[PDB]
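Hey forum,

I'm writing up a methods section and want to include a predicted complex as supplementary material. The small molecule is zinc ion. I've pasted the protein sequence and the SMILES. Can someone with a working setup run it? I'll credit the forum in the acknowledgements.
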Amino acid sequence: ASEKRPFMCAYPGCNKRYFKLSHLQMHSRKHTGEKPYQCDFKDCERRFSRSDQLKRHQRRHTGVKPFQCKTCQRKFSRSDHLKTHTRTHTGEKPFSCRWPSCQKKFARSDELVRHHNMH
DNA sequence: CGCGGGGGCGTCTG
DNA sequence: CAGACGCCCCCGCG
Ligand SMILES: [Zn+2]
Ligand SMILES: [Zn+2]
Ligand SMILES: [Zn+2]
Ligand SMILES: [Zn+2]
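Reply by user p_vandermeer:
Happy to help. Structure tokens for the complex are below, copy them as they are.
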């Protein structure tokens, strides 16, 4: 089970062996969302299973909003919110309804999900 | 009702 | 592995 292990996983819940550095880099991605960090704040006590999740969450406390709109100059702290809001200025509404008499279009999957719950 | 704003998660690239 | 991009999901508000 380890008589030949060019590489191993660095996650303490795994520590299994691998042979291709890249194929192990791919395996490791599964564990990148299994590392329980915690907030550093004295006004928080949350835990995040990824560095990016914690780093994103930190912005909620710092108030930092580096993603600024080119149109209305609004400021956001998540690229997903900014790109979503971008579609509001771009008129990009690809989430059209599939019901037998509607086809109403939204710029967000969840907006379409709520709309469908109205049917 | 349209959209802000946080949670969780897969994933390519570095 | 981590940093960064993209989405789905859920909730709250004017
Ligand atoms: Zn592993
Ligand atoms: Zn926090
Ligand atoms: Zn804008
Ligand atoms: Zn519909």
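Some notes you might quote in the supplement: The longest strand of chain A covers residues 7-8. Residues 26, 29-30, 32-33, 48-50, 53, 56-57, 60, 74, 76-78, 81, 84-85, 88, 106-108, 111, 114-115, 118 of chain A lie near DNA strand B (CB under 10 Å from a C1').
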